[PDB]
Amino acid sequence: ELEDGIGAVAPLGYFDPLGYIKDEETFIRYRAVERKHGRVAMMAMLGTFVHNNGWTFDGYLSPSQGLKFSDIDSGIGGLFQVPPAGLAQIILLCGFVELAWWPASNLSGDYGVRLGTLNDWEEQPAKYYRQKNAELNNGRAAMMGILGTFTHEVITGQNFAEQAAAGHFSPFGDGQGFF
């Protein structure tokens, strides 16, 4: 919300530098998207932290196709390694949350998820502002991290485990790009 100053944190303040908020109704649409994109991209960043660390389940993801959990790539192509009979299950459960349980039509972003004494907002309202800003700020940093993780695999061809094993962290002197 604008009046509490939820997204405006202390390094930059009200960081709308290109002038996109020209009234109050288009802020609530944009914050509903920013908070939703931040919640998706945070679980996307914890995915790449877990996948590129090699932490896999034991057994077969698809035993009728013989596809182990170990032979899914930890990079940007690992989701499509998965058989489409299997990730139709992912789209159908996540689509059921998006329409019924956590309806993404709710622009407020509240879905009542309260983990009680870890947020007693009625007796410490400063913890409300701390946890509301940190949901956006960790979502904004993970939105740029997953755009980092995606394009670093595209321009190098290696995933994050492979380009860190090679020490390939500089776009200069390598055989890739015109630099």
Binding site: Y14, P17, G19, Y20, I21, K22, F172, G173
Partner: protein, 227 residues
């Protein structure tokens, strides 16, 4: 209702650096070096001295003294790091002991010369860079709101350190401020290219320019065999 920065893009005066792009209203003209260059609108969203604590984290409206403070300290370091990227390749290197190891100060690639010199060389440079930043914070503690950006109390005016006299006239002094700022912005671009070429070539810049400003060994004429 509207953003505080959407109102600065509503006035949106004519620019000079980007004369097709209509610089925002927060570039008032009253600052040194403002040429109407803010296409991303950072001056509409001004920062405060966050390092002083939480009460300094907010930025005052219309005050870019901390953006200019970070601009001057980036450019003053960048200026002396052009020479640091160049002068070992031009004026030779320093010799080493058996303690530090011979050829420790002798890596003409400036980026892996960071990882070749001893750690006590890097630590004492960092602590000297630390000491003048302690001197900076103690100046911004004392001056506060009347703190001029880039002031380390070195030079001409009030009770500053002036071992050279340096007693400029009061508007040849603002030309020196503009000469400093234009060299700050230029050497920031220059030290980026030095850092990027040292990675891309693997050698120093005198070692890449000097190899390109020389004739190749197969193209060189044998030359001057006429008695």
């Amino acid at each position: 209702g509207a953003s505080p920065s959407a109102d600065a893009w509503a006035n949106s005066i004519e620019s000079k650096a980007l004369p097709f792009a209509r610089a925002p209203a927060t570039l008032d003209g009253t600052m040194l070096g403002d040429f109407g260059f803010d296409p991303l609108g950072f001056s509409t969203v001004p920062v405060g001295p966050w390092f002083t604590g939480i009460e300094g984290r907010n930025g005052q409206i219309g005050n870019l003294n901390w953006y200019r403070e970070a601009e001057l300290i980036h450019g003053r370091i960048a200026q002396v790091a052009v020479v640091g990227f160049i002068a070992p390749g031009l004026f030779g290197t320093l010799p080493g002991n058996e303690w530090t190891g011979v050829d420790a100060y002798s890596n003409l690639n400036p980026l892996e010369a960071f990882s070749q010199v001893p750690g006590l060389a890097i630590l004492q440079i960092f602590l000297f860079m630390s000491y003048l930043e302690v001197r900076r914070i103690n100046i911004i503690k004392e001056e506060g709101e009347n703190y001029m950006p880039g002031d380390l109390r070195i030079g001409q005016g009030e009770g500053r350190w002036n071992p050279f006299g340096l007693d400029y006239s009061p508007e040849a002094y603002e030309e020196k401020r503009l000469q400093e700022l234009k060299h700050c912005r230029l050497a920031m671009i220059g030290v980026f290219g030095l850092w990027a070429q040292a990675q891309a070539s693997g050698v120093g810049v005198t070692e890449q320019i000097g190899a390109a400003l020389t004739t190749p060994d197969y193209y060189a004429k044998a030359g001057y065999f006429l008695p």
